[PDB]
Amino acid sequence: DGAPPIMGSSVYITVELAIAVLAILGNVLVCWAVWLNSNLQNVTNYFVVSLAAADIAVGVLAIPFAITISTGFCAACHGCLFIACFVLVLTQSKIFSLLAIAIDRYIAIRIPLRYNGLVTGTRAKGIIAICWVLSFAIGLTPMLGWNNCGQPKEGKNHSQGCGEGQVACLFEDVVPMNYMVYFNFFACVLVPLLLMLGVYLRIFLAARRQLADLEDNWETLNDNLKVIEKADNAAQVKDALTKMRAAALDAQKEMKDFRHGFDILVGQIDDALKLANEGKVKEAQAAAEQLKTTRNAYIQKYLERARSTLQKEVHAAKSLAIIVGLFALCWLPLHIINCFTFFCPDCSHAPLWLMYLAIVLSHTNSVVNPFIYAYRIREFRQTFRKIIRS
Ligand SMILES: CC(C)CCC[C@@H](C)[C@H]1CC[C@H]2[C@@H]3CC=C4C[C@@H](O)CC[C@]4(C)[C@H]3CC[C@]12C
Ligand SMILES: CC(C)CCC[C@@H](C)[C@H]1CC[C@H]2[C@@H]3CC=C4C[C@@H](O)CC[C@]4(C)[C@H]3CC[C@]12C
Ligand SMILES: CC(C)CCC[C@@H](C)[C@H]1CC[C@H]2[C@@H]3CC=C4C[C@@H](O)CC[C@]4(C)[C@H]3CC[C@]12C
Ligand SMILES: CCCCCCCC/C=C/CCCCCCCC(=O)OC[C@H](O)CO
Ligand SMILES: CCCCCCCC/C=C\CCCCCCCC(=O)O
Ligand SMILES: CCCCCCCC/C=C\CCCCCCCC(=O)O
Ligand SMILES: CCCCCCCC/C=C\CCCCCCCC(=O)O
């Protein structure tokens, strides 16, 4: 006395097709933008393109595969495994791309001087090619023998009248739930997500620490100037200048103007240090006053350009952290439900409508990333305008 299955099926099928169209259109626009604008052609966005290629494949293949496996049609169990598991291949690829982006950004903020030599486009494409081969091996592991094809549901296969060697193609009838929980969720999804959480925490820690160091060196320059103007003994000017020369060199360690600025700064510190060692207090106090002009016309510009760059890395890393968060928000419900089905055999199985609500929610993840770029990355947003208005 249940309502006809095709009614609820029509809603689910229609919602899936709507998601597939939006996932294809949005992520093709991402790939078109990277191809068009040279400012978007860096190593980081090569993983973003690999991320967009997987979401395009979700709408082109994974979502039609989801509609197919919802019917329970008769099929050879191994071809039925590919239909069920190919979305795991695409999802795993996205995990590798997201982990590489966070690692790339950690390298850009921990060792920015060595980034361009270490992280190159040739090495990135190799990483992406390797991670795609690993994603196939991980997602299609049930095809290697870790499946329930050896224990078919003979009642379901005879009721639907399947042929010899065929089974009723159902995700939970062919894909073992211990693979989905232990291997896929715990090892291949949950652990990499916790790793990205650790990488981003180190990124924000590295940014907060470097921002504090610039202010410490900047305040050390100005506070030690007051020590010189109010000094009385030659050693009071010598010790104050010694702690400035270190703060001057430790700050530097149109790019020649920033180097020429520290040369005048440290060159003036050595001048006053020579006068302070000779005992000339007044002549060293006046020599140290010339540092104020150099601080304004040179050092103050570096303080706020290096601060502006670090703040851009914080803002950009937060935008990329949202993509990881929305990935977790879209996929965790489906994983959590699998944990209930596997770990609590005495719990009632999650209802049909909730299963397909979680399945649909995981597919919406292929729609959100182009919106994050448009709202949080100006270079993506301006290129999106240029593409659309033209
Ligand atoms: C380049 C792209 C677009 C090619 C698309 C490949 C897809 C559509 C092909 C490749 C393998 C095929 C599967 C392999 C054989 C199985 C078993 C059969 O009993 C039912 C069909 C089924 C489930 C096929 C469904 C369609 C299938 C998944
Ligand atoms: C990551 C964020 C969105 C958290 C998501 C919470 C979801 C995944 C949780 C909250 C309540 C949970 C449900 C509460 C208990 C019921 C009854 C049980 O017989 C089957 C599991 C089922 C249906 C759970 C399924 C998963 C569930 C719906
Ligand atoms: C990303 C972070 C939040 C980790 C994910 C949380 C998961 C691993 C936790 C949260 C809720 C937990 C479930 C809540 C209680 C149920 C019922 C119990 O009889 C079996 C364990 C089971 C099924 C737990 C399995 C693991 C579980 C799903
Ligand atoms: C089976 C599921 C789990 C298995 C996981 C552990 C496998 C062990 C190690 C595999 C080596 C990696 C193989 C992938 C590399 C393929 C070759 C390639 O494309 O690399 C080109 C790169 O640019 C350089 O040449
Ligand atoms: C451009 C590539 C995408 C175009 C094709 C996708 C549109 C059709 C999607 C899949 C239709 C569902 C096929 C399920 C067949 C069930 C077999 C059965 O009748 O029991
Ligand atoms: C510049 C980078 C281009 C990336 C290209 C991505 C294409 C990767 C192709 C598929 C590799 C699949 C091979 C994996 C074999 C094991 C899977 C299995 O059969 O179980
Ligand atoms: C198969 C060899 C694996 C090692 C090479 C891949 C490089 C590291 C990949 C991810 C491992 C987990 C990353 C955790 C934080 C790493 C960032 C760091 O410590 O610098």
d(CA 237, CA 227): 7
Asked whether the beta carbons of 218 and 306 are under 8 A apart, the reply is no
H/E element, 74: strand 74-76
d(CA 388, CA 390): 5
Experimental technique behind these coordinates: X-ray
Closest listed residue to residue 27, CA positions, set 49, 9, 3, 1: 49
What tokens does 336 get?
Answer: 């959590």
Q: Is residue 351 helix, strand or coil? A: coil
Residue nearest to atom 2 of ligand 3 (CA): 190
Q: Which residues does 276 contact at the CB level (< 8 Å), separation at least 6?
A: 234, 237, 238, 241, 284
Taken in order 364, 366, 372, 378, the sign of the CA dihedral is negative
Q: Which residues does 303 contact at the CB level (< 8 Å), separation at least 6?
A: 214, 218
Taking CB atoms and a 6 Å cutoff, what residues make up the pocket around ligand 2? 329, 332-333, 336-337, 340, 347-348, 350, 354
CA 127 – ligand 7 centroid, Å: 12
In Å, the largest CA–CA distance within the chain is 105
CATH number, domain with residue 257: 1.20.120.10
CA 335 – ligand 3 centroid, Å: 9
Query: Residue 133: CB within 6 Å of ligand 6?
Result: yes
User: Does 313 map to a domain?
Assistant: no
CA 342 – ligand 3 centroid, Å: 11
Asked whether the beta carbons of 347 and 2 are under 8 A apart, the reply is no
Whether residues 117 and 254 share a domain: the answer is no
Whether residues 77 and 221 share a domain: the answer is no
Whether residues 151 and 222 share a domain: the answer is no
What tokens does 113 get?
Answer: 């001087």
Whether residues 120 and 217 share a domain: the answer is no
State the CB neighbour count (10 A cutoff) for residue 149: 17
Out of 199, 201, 205, mutate this one to test ligand 7's pocket (max ligand atoms within 8 Å of CB): namely 199
Taking CB atoms and a 6 Å cutoff, what residues make up the pocket around ligand 3? 336, 339-340, 343-344
Residue nearest to atom 5 of ligand 7 (CA): 127
d(CA 388, CA 87): 30
**Rounded (10°) angle between helices 77-110 and 121-139:** 150
Q: What secondary structure letter does DSSP report for 75?
A: E
H-state helical runs in the chain: 5-36, 43-57, 63-69, 77-110, 115-118, 121-139, 154-159, 171-174, 177-178, 191-229, 234-252, 255-277, 281-289, 291-294, 300-343, 352-363, 365-376, 378-389
State the CB neighbour count (10 A cutoff) for residue 124: 19
Whether residues 23 and 171 share a domain: the answer is yes
User: DSSP letter string over 153-176?
Assistant: -HHHHHHTT--TTEEE--HHHHS-
d(CA 57, CA 257): 49
Query: Residue 290: CB within 6 Å of ligand 5?
Result: no
Residue-range definition of the domain harbouring residue 129: 5-175+351-389
d(CA 188, CA 77): 24
Residue 169 CA, closest ligand 1 atom number: 23
* Count of structural domains within the chain: 2
Q: Calculate the alpha carbon distances from 133 to 22, 90, 96, 136, 295 in Å.
A: 27, 11, 11, 5, 55
Residue 347 CA, closest ligand 2 atom number: 19
Ligand nearest the Cα atom of residue 132 = 6
User: Does 381 map to a domain?
Assistant: yes
